Design an enzyme around this catalytic site. Structure first.
Site: not given
Ligand SMILES: *[C@@H]1O[C@H](CO)[C@@H](O)[C@H](O)[C@H]1NC(C)=O
Ligand SMILES: [Ca+2]
Length: 477
Positions: A35, A206, A230
């Site tokens: 990550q 988002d 979204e």
């Protein structure tokens, strides 16, 4: 660009950190499990535009560009861009403002749009919600601009979903008070200023469901462009209404039955069938939604099944359904990563093979779509609708009569048997010749109006009138 301008677009969704490095390496290590920033940059995108445009895409949607929290959290870096802190600065990992400007320029030059992912719901912070030093956030440098601290525990309580914080005490996301006019005006001036300074054609918003609706209209207006949001819910009743406050939303209602229909040779064609009609009537405008079956918040399609035929069919549906097609980088290379972070694989590690099976299927699908629109101004507005279905099949029709595309999809898989489907309802003229633009073969409409479609290898078939192809370079033989 405007919503109308976007109807005809085809989107290639990519994570800026994971698409292409400035050096162009295809072997540079990127362990999704770590990550960490892997190196992807905006310049890397410019250098691989041929690769993207070569699939028939007309636009790209890149992750958030704002400066993120600096730290490598226990959950890794903010390589995905959803943990911002300074909205008037850019994530230097991707490059400079000149690089971002150069990116959109290179696109507009190719006649393609640039869509940017933006977050208005929260900032990011490395640490417990109680340790947040608000002075770090800019311009919202005070705890007042934010909602009181609390983690969203009951997602059935909409007010909570909008007033409490996402994330946890490992990595908390300070929740902005989107009701205070100071916040809204700052956000409205920002977004307008953002689109302007980078020549952005559209926006992907988002976490839209975590911000109260009365905020979105003004944001959409300030943006001055098309905004697709979204709303992470598969219930069309809960998700579709948001289009009244935003030009469009991601089609999560179709996503679930879509995935289930093609992820195995026993998927429910019925569920997909019906969700198509439900969305067509209940949603403000199905042609402004975004179709997809793969993204960074769900296991990739190939993680469920490695069947290439099924992959082709689902990809074909995405491009031919109502709305804007959205393919997530790596999908065209049959990537199979699972749930986040496993689904954020670097695109470059595939070697960008332009001859991979899904790269061709997508090119072919986007080609017929792009062509049809160029000759039929009513295509994008013509509501797709299903004319047939059986336990392993579904056929739909979209486009003005005489120029419609008739798509036949199957979940039989790669080992599917060979047979002839007598398709009725397509609406083509008896005796007319059609071209199956995926495999580039012809079929002739029968005297009775039915179309004898050769089915084999569980492959998707997409029909269009052969005569209409006059001139184009689709299926030149
Ligand atoms: C627009 O550009 C000016 C200077 O060129 C910069 O100060 C301003 O912050 C930019 N707007 C945004 C939101 O990036
Ligand atoms: Ca919120």
């Amino acid at each position: 660009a405007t919503p109308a301008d976007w109807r005809s677009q085809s989107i290639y969704f990519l994570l800026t950190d994971r698409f292409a490095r400035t050096d162009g390496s295809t072997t540079a290590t990127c362990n999704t499990a770590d990550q960490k920033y892997c190196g992807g940059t905006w310049q890397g995108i410019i250098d691989k535009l041929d690769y993207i445009q070569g699939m028939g895409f007309t636009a790209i949607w890149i992750t958030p560009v704002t400066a993120q929290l600096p730290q490598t959290t226990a959950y890794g870096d903010a390589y995905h861009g959803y943990w911002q802190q300074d909205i008037y600065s850019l994530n230097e990992n991707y490059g400079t403002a000149d690089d971002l400007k150069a990116l959109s320029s290179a696109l507009h030059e190719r006649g393609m749009y640039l869509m940017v992912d933006v977050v208005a719901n929260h900032m990011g912070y490395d640490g417990a919600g109680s340790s947040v030093d608000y002075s770090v956030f800019k311009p919202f440098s005070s705890q007042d601009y934010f909602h009181p601290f609390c983690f969203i525990q009951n997602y059935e309580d909409q007010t909570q979903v909008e007033d409490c914080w996402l994330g946890d005490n490992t990595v908390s996301l300070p929740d902005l008070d989107t009701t205070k006019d100071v916040v809204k005006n700052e956000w409205y001036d920002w977004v307008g200023s953002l689109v302007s300074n980078y020549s952005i054609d559209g926006l992907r918003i988002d976490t839209v469901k975590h911000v109260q609706k009365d905020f979105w209209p003004g944001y959409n207006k300030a943006a001055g462009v098309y905004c697709i949001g979204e709303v992470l819910d598969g219930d069309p009743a809960y998700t579709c209404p948001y289009q009244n406050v935003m030009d469009g939303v991601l089609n999560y209602p179709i996503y679930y039955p879509l995935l289930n229909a093609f992820k195995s040779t026993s998927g429910s064609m019925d569920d997909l069938y019906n969700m198509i009609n439900t969305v067509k009537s209940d949603c403000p405008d199905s042609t402004l939604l975004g179709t997809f079956v793969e993204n960074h918040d769900n296991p990739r399609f190939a993680s469920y099944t490695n069947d290439i035929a099924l992959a082709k069919n689902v990809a074909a549906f995405i491009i031919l359904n109502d709305g804007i097609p959205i393919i997530y980088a790596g999908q065209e290379q049959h990537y199979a990563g699972g749930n986040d972070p496993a689904n954020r694989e670097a695109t470059w590690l595939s070697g960008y093979p332009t001859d991979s099976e899904l790269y061709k299927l997508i090119a072919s699908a986007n080609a017929i779509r792009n062509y049809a629109i160029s000759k039929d101004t009513g295509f994008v507005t013509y509501k797709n609708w299903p004319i047939y279905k059986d336990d392993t099949t579904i056929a739909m029709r979209k486009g003005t009569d005489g120029s419609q595309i008739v798509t036949i999809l199957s979940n039989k898989g790669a080992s599917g048997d060979s047979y002839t489907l007598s398709l009725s309802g397509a609406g083509y003229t008896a005796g007319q010749q059609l071209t199956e633009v995926i495999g580039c073969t012809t079929v002739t409409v029968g005297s009775d109006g039915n179309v004898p479609v050769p089915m084999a290898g569980g492959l998707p078939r997409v029909l269009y009138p052969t005569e209409k192809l006059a001139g184009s370079k689709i299926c030149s033989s």
